[PDB]
Amino acid sequence: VLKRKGLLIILDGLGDRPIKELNGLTPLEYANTPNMDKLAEIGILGQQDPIKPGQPAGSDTAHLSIFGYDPYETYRGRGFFEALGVGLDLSKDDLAFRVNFATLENARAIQEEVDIGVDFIFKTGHRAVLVLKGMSRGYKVGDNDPHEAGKPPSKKVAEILEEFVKKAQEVLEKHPINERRRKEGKPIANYLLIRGAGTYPNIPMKFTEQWKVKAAGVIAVALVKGVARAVGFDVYTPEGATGEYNTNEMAKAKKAVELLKDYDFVFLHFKPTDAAGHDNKPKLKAELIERADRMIGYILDHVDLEEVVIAITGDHSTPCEVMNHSGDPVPLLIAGGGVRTDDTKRFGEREAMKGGLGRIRGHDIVPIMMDLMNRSEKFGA
Amino acid sequence: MVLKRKGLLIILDGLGDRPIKELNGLTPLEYANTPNMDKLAEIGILGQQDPIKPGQPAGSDTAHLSIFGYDPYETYRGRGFFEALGVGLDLSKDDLAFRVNFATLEEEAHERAIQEEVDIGVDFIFKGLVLKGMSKVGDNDLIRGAGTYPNIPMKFTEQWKVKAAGVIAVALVKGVARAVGFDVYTPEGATGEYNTNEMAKAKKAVELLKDYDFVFLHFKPTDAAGHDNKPKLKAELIERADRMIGYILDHVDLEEVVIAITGDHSTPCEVMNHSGDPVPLLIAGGGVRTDDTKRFGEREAMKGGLGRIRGHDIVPIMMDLMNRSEKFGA
Numbered sequence A: 001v002l003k004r005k006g007l008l009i010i011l012d013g014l015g016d017r018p019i020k021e022l023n024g025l026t027p028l029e030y031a032n033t034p035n036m037d038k039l040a041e042i043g044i045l046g047q048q049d050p051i052k053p054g055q056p057a058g059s060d061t062a063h064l065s066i067f068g069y070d071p072y073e074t075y076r077g078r079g080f081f082e083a084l085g086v087g088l089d090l091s092k093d094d095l096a097f098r099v100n101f102a103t104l105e106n107a108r109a110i111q112e113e114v115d116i117g118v119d120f121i122f123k124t125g126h127r128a129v130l131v132l133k134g135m136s137r138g139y140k141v142g143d144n145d146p147h148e149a150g151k152p153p154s155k156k157v158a159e160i161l162e163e164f165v166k167k168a169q170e171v172l173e174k175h176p177i178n179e180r181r182r183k184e185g186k187p188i189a190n191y192l193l194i195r196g197a198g199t200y201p202n203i204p205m206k207f208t209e210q211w212k213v214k215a216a217g218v219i220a221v222a223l224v225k226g227v228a229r230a231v232g233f234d235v236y237t238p239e240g241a242t243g244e245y246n247t248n249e250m251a252k253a254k255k256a257v258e259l260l261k262d263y264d265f266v267f268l269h270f271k272p273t274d275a276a277g278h279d280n281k282p283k284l285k286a287e288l289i290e291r292a293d294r295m296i297g298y299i300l301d302h303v304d305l306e307e308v309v310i311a312i313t314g315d316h317s318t319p320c321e322v323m324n325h326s327g328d329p330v331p332l333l334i335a336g337g338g339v340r341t342d343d344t345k346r347f348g349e350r351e352a353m354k355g356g357l358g359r360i361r362g363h364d365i366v367p368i369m370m371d372l373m374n375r376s377e378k379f380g381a
Numbered sequence B: 001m002v003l004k005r006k007g008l009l010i011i012l013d014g015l016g017d018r019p020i021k022e023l024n025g026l027t028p029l030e031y032a033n034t035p036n037m038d039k040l041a042e043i044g045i046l047g048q049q050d051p052i053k054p055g056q057p058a059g060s061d062t063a064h065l066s067i068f069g070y071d072p073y074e075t076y077r078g079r080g081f082f083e084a085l086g087v088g089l090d091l092s093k094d095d096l097a098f099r100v101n102f103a104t105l106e107e108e109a110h111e112r113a114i115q116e117e118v119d120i121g122v123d124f125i126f127k128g129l130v131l132k133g134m135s136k137v138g139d140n141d142l143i144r145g146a147g148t149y150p151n152i153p154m155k156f157t158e159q160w161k162v163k164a165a166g167v168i169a170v171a172l173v174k175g176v177a178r179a180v181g182f183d184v185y186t187p188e189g190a191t192g193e194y195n196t197n198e199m200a201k202a203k204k205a206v207e208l209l210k211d212y213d214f215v216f217l218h219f220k221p222t223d224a225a226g227h228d229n230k231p232k233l234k235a236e237l238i239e240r241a242d243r244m245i246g247y248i249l250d251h252v253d254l255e256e257v258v259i260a261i262t263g264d265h266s267t268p269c270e271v272m273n274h275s276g277d278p279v280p281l282l283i284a285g286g287g288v289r290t291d292d293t294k295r296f297g298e299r300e301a302m303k304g305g306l307g308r309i310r311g312h313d314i315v316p317i318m319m320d321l322m323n324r325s326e327k328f329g330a
C-alpha cells in the first residue's frame, strides 16, 4: 500500500464573526476564494477548537495543538519558542523571555534601534550567563542559562531578573540613541519589560519521530517558527516572507511545492490575516484571505491531490469585532486521496458547521491527516 | 389605503450559461464575485425562467417581447423595425425596416469602423429610403431582418396604468422598449460594449425612479462575452454589473422598490450563441416571501421558491408585488 505526503496550511486568525458591513458574512465567506471552495467541494469540512469550546488560545499554544499535541500538558510558556524563533540554539534547561523596551521615569522604537540597544546590553553582567538578542520593533528576547526549573516567575530567577533590569537600565540610560532621544524629545528606551517565561515544551517525542516522517515548514513569524522548531520541523523562510501585509505569499507557495519533493509533511503559515483581525478591518482581512486563495491556487496547480493530502484552517479565531483571539471554533477543510467528500460546496464558517468531520479538537487534525496519508499505526491486536 | 410600490427590472443580456471546466465546473455567474446579487438572493426569492419555452432559444428582441409581458409569436413581425425604432426614427405601418452591416467585399472578406466614420459613410450613401448610422439601418416605405410594424395588443404603460422608463444603450432593445410604450434613455458613457459605463446606467436609473413607477435597466456586454466564448471575461462583466447593482441598493428603499434581476436568455460560452437553457431569476423587496437560497446562480435558482416560470410571468409577478395588479372576478 502507498503512503501519501501532507500539506497543512494555516491562515492565522482565520475565524471570525458575522460582519454587518459584509451583509452578515464573515471575511472568509465574503472574500472571493474560488480555490478553497473547490477544495471544500471535493473534500470534507469541519470545525476545530484549538483548545476547547469557547477557550481563546495564544498563537503558541494553538500551534502546539495544530501540530498534534495537548497544549494543557505540553505548554511550558512562550519565551523558549520566541528564542528558538530568532534562530538561537538553546538547551532544554534554559529559560527564555519576551522583552519589550519601555520608558521609566520618576516609544515605538525602530527595529535597528533595538538591535543596537540589545548589542550593548550583551556586551550587563550578573551571576548567570545570558543571551539578549533583539527581534523586531521595540521587542527583544532574554535567555537565562540552565534556569528552566525557575520557569514560573522561581525566587532565584526573579532576583536575577531584578538585578538585570537595574543593571540593564544603566547600560540603556546611556546609549547615544537614547541620548539623541531625550534631546529630540522622544521617550527613551531605558526600561525592560520582561514576560512570557518559557522552557522547552513537555512533549513525549518530536513530530518527526512520532510519525516517522521528514517535516519542513514555510514560516516567517518568529513565535511560530519557534514552536515548529521545538517539535522538530526544518523551518524555512523564503525571500520576501515577512509575516506582514507586504509578505510574498506566492514565494511561500513556490517554496512549499519545492519542499514537498524532499519532505513527507509540509507546514505553511500565513500571518497577515491575523493582523487585520486585531485592527478591526473586515474588508482588509477578506482582501488578505483572497491573497491566500491565490497562494493556494498556485500550489494546487503544481501538486497531485492523490499523492498529497491537504488541510487548511486557522490556528484560532480573531474576530474583527473582538480585536483579539476569540474562542470561536475555526473552519477546517481536508481534501486529497482517501477523503470521503461530504456535500459542502464552499469554504466558510457556516458551511463548516455542516461538514462531515464534525466538531473536533485542533490536535485531532494531524492524526486524521496521517491516517489519510496511510502513515498511522494501529493500537492493539 | 394600501401603498403601491415602484418596480425596477434589471436585465443582464445572456446571463445564463453552462458549467465551465476552467471555472471548476461552475458557470460564469456562480464563479463571479457578486456580493450584491447574493445578498438580494438571500433576502429575496429565486427561480428559473424560460424566455419562450423549455429548450427554445430566443433572439434578443423576441426574448424582450416575452420579458415585457407579451407573446413572442403573436407580436413579433421582424427585427428591422425595432432596429429602426432604436435609432430615433418614426416609421409608418407600410414601412419595411432592415438591419445593415458595413463590411469589406473583395467574396465577403470582412463584415470595425469608428462610429463617426459610419455616420460620414451613412451621410454620403443617403446623399446621392432612409439609411441611418447607429453604432446601420435601412427603411423602405449584410442587410437583413426584414421587419414591419409590430403587432402588440396595447402599450405596457396603459396595460399596467403606470409611467415606464428604460435605461438602454443597444439599438435593438431600445426599439422593442419604445415600441411597447417606454420612455427610453441612454446616458453618456453607456455604449453596450465592454467599454460602457455601468455607473451612468445605475445613476440614471435611480433618478428615473423618482418620476416613474417602473424602471427597466438593460446591460448588453455580458452577452458579447458569451458569443466569443470568454468565460473569465463574462464573469468580470457580471462583477461590474454587481457593482452597478450595489450603487442602486445604496440609494433605493427596497420596501418601496420591488427589484428583479435576470437575463433575457442563455448565451453559454461553449455554444457561442443563444441556448434554450432557462435563465436564473431573482426578485427582492416589499411583499416578497423570501425562500432559503443564499446566492445567485443557475444551481441555486434550481431551488428557488418561484419555481420554473415563463419570461412573460415576470412583469405580472412584479406588478402584483407592487400592488398594481387587478382582480378578475368577485
Ligand SMILES: [Ca+2]
Pocket (backbone or CB within 6 Å): A040, A041, A042, A043, A341, A342, A343, A344
Ligand atoms: Ca462534495
Ligand SMILES: [Ca+2]
Pocket (backbone or CB within 6 Å): B041, B042, B043, B044, B290, B291, B292, B293
Ligand atoms: Ca432567504
Ligand SMILES: [Zn+2]
Pocket (backbone or CB within 6 Å): A012, A013, A058, A059, A062, A274, A315, A316
Ligand atoms: Zn495566531
Ligand SMILES: [Zn+2]
Pocket (backbone or CB within 6 Å): A013, A059, A274, A275, A278, A318, A325
Ligand atoms: Zn493574533
Ligand SMILES: [Zn+2]
Pocket (backbone or CB within 6 Å): B013, B014, B059, B060, B061, B063, B223, B264, B265
Ligand atoms: Zn439578448
Ligand SMILES: [Zn+2]
Pocket (backbone or CB within 6 Å): B014, B060, B223, B224, B227, B267, B274
Ligand atoms: Zn446575443
